[PDB]
Design a protein around this ligand. Structure first.
Ligand SMILES: OC[C@H]1O[C@H](O[C@@H]2[C@@H](O)[C@H](O)O[C@H](CO)[C@@H]2O)[C@H](O)[C@@H](O)[C@H]1O
Ligand SMILES: [Cl-]
Ligand SMILES: [Cl-]
Ligand SMILES: [Cl-]
Ligand SMILES: [Cl-]
Ligand SMILES: [Cl-]
Ligand SMILES: [Cl-]
Ligand SMILES: [Cl-]
Lengths: 218, 216
């Protein structure tokens, strides 16, 4: 199975530097032309940089020429992107990808969000959305977690460490008037299972190294 | 740089019916080796892009023959013979003939389906939040279609304005529905001044506007 696992996303102020990494597996990395593309919020993909099999040819789009550096370590099956002198326009989800021929990218990483912004890092507050007669609809109950006042994106939410996925909706983050983000994650369960089954939301906000396990009770 | 222009910008389709997406380049995409390098990608909500078509008409190994690519020179078409629910999302063309490689702006494929009224849930603020000084009241609408819905907040039967925000999920990859959250934000002191908090929902699926209330 082919995997490309990226890391290093996060927040840096304008003029700063950040380093992304892309760890491959499942194919012969040394024999692959490799690529970085990015997607700005609400837009489509755009090229950033690529590197051929020996590392002898490095291409950069005009906007990042002289500020970004692409490199590879074949013995570690790793692709790197060193970003310097970052601008707000560089804010995007960055994807590493394998290029078999002429931009027809066939294997993609999971994405890494780079935010370029001067605002402070703020870890979220997690509040329960408790099930009650008012979160009942027929034979079903809704419960959730309110992940409030964090910066920057992203936060991830899972339920019972990933074992609970049916009926789950984690909403996209909302920009609040304060400039901080907020989101809710909710799950619909049979109301008969309340008081029997435990429900825990796992909130992760890496930029502030916040990992929370909040038990949501009726 | 080569300009890739896609049309339509949004395409409403019902399951089982065909769909067509066009893509135009500002230059010919014939490379000096005689091949034309045009690919199509699909981005499902909250996921990485995924390759469908390349070299104008080659289908990716994990992509069924329902998808087909066609065209020449600067005019290209992606066709889905029968649309499935998992086809929802944004589609991009990409030329690789010239450097830099350029993507289209995207075409949103939207699934039309039968009306589904929302289930409505309301949550009072938690006591942990109240200890901090602010009150959030959350109204939830789950698994509805179409997307258009009206959510009004009433505090002691007074209509609210300017103190609530909405978040809407993208159309689901399995059942093709939406979910929506509306959040009323108030100081603790303002929250403790009133008694009845109501979320009124207007949707085509409901038998009439629905209200979910609680007494603080
Ligand atoms: O060297 C010119 C060209 O290199 C990269 O695109 C190449 C493509 O030309 C080659 O034939 O195929 C590989 C696939 O492995 C790459 O897609 C750059 O992306 C491009 O900007 C240009 O610089
Ligand atoms: Cl800034
Ligand atoms: Cl987020
Ligand atoms: Cl489950
Ligand atoms: Cl960070
Ligand atoms: Cl219509
Ligand atoms: Cl239907
Ligand atoms: Cl009720």
């Amino acid at each position: 199975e082919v995997q490309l696992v990226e890391s290093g996303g996060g927040l840096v102020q304008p003029g700063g530097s950040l380093r992304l990494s892309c760890a491959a597996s499942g194919f012969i990395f040394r024999d692959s032309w490799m690529t970085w593309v990015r997607q700005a919020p609400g837009k489509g993909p755009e090229w950033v940089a690529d590197i051929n099999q020996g590392g002898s040819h490095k291409y950069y789009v005009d906007s990042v020429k002289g500020r970004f550096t692409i490199s590879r370590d074949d013995a570690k099956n790793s692709l790197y992107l060193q970003m310097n002198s970052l601008r707000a326009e560089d804010t995007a989800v960055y994807y590493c990808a394998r290029d078999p021929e002429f931009g027809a990218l066939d294997y993609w990483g999971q994405g890494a969000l780079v935010t370029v912004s001067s605002a402070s890092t703020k870890g979220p507050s997690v509040f329960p959305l408790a099930p009650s007669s008012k979160s009942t609809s027929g034979g079903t109950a809704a419960l959730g977690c309110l992940v409030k006042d964090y910066f920057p994106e992203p936060v991830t939410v899972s339920w019972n460490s990933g074992a609970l996925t049916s009926g789950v909706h984690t909403f996209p983050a909302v920009l609040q008037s304060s400039g901080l983000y907020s989101l809710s994650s909710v799950v619909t369960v049979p109301s008969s299972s309340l008081g029997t089954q435990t429900y825990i939301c796992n909130v992760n906000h890496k930029p502030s190294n916040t990992k929370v396990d909040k038990k949501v009770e009726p | 740089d080569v300009v890739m222009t896609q049309s339509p910008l949004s395409l409403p389709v019902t399951l089982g019916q065909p769909a067509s997406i066009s893509c135009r380049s500002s230059q010919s995409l014939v490379y000096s080796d005689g091949n034309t390098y045009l690919a199509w990608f699909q981005q499902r909500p909250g996921q990485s892009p995924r390759r469908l078509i390349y070299r104008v008409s080659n289908r990716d190994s994990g992509v069924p023959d329902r998808f087909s690519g066609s065209g020449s020179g600067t005019d290209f078409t992606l066709k889905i013979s029968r649309v499935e629910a998992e086809d929802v999302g944004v589609y991009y063309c990409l030329q690789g003939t010239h450097g830099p490689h350029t993507f289209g702006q995207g075409t949103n494929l939207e699934i039309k389906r039968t009306v589904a009224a929302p289930s409505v849930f309301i949550f009072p603020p938690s006591d942990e939040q109240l200890k901090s000084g602010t009150a959030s009241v959350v109204c939830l609408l789950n698994n509805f279609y179409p997307r258009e819905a009206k959510v009004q907040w009433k505090v002691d039967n007074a209509l609210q304005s300017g103190n609530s925000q909405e978040s809407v999920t993208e159309q689901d990859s399995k059942d093709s529905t939406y979910s929506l959250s509306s959040t009323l934000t108030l100081s603790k002191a303002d929250y403790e001044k009133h008694k009845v908090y109501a979320c009124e929902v207007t949707h085509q699926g409901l038998s009439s506007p629905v209200t979910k209330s609680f007494n603080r």
